[PDB]
């Protein structure tokens, strides 16, 4: 049982994993497999923190998922170099991504889910 902003949460989650074939940044990043990762990014996020966070009902807004999506393609700009493939990943997804979330579709779906309130 999921509100109607749950499920359009969802919907935009899935359509921006669809921008990371290679599950780049489907899953945290360790300091195993990136020493001194805590100590440089101080709010880390990733595709399955923000599922997570649908799944609780921790999201009020699109707004405040689009926020976690920028946060998470800025940290990997900030922990890898401008050579590195992960951070030239992270700026096309996060270019792609802001498309995606666009305050025009943002719009049209904050539409459907007030029509889907007070009957
Ligand atoms: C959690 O797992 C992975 C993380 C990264 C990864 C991501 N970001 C954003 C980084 O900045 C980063 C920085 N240094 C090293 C690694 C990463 C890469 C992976 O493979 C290439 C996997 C493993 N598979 C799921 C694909």
Redesign the pocket.
């Given at each position: 049982e999921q509100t109607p902003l749950q499920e359009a949460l969802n919907q935009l989650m899935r359509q921006l994993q669809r921008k990371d074939p290679?599950?780049?940044?489907?899953?945290?990043?360790?300091d195993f497999?990136?020493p001194g990762?805590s100590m440089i990014i101080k709010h880390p996020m990733d595709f399955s923190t923000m599922k997570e966070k649908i799944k609780n009902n921790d999201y009020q807004s699109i707004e405040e998922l689009k926020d976690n999506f920028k946060l998470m393609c800025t940290?990997?700009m900030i922990?890898?170099k401008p050579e590195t493939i992960?951070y030239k990943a992270?700026k096309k997804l996060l270019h792609s991504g802001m498309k995606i979330l666009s305050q025009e579709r943002i719009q049209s779906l904050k539409q459907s889910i007030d029509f889907m309130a007070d009957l």
């Amino acid at each position: 049982e999921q509100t109607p902003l749950q499920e359009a949460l969802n919907q935009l989650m899935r359509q921006l994993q669809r921008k990371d074939p290679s599950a780049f940044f489907s899953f945290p990043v360790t300091d195993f497999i990136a020493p001194g990762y805590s100590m440089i990014i101080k709010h880390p996020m990733d595709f399955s923190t923000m599922k997570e966070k649908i799944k609780n009902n921790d999201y009020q807004s699109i707004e405040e998922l689009k926020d976690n999506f920028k946060l998470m393609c800025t940290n990997a700009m900030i922990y890898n170099k401008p050579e590195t493939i992960y951070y030239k990943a992270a700026k096309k997804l996060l270019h792609s991504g802001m498309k995606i979330l666009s305050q025009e579709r943002i719009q049209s779906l904050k539409q459907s889910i007030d029509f889907m309130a007070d009957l």
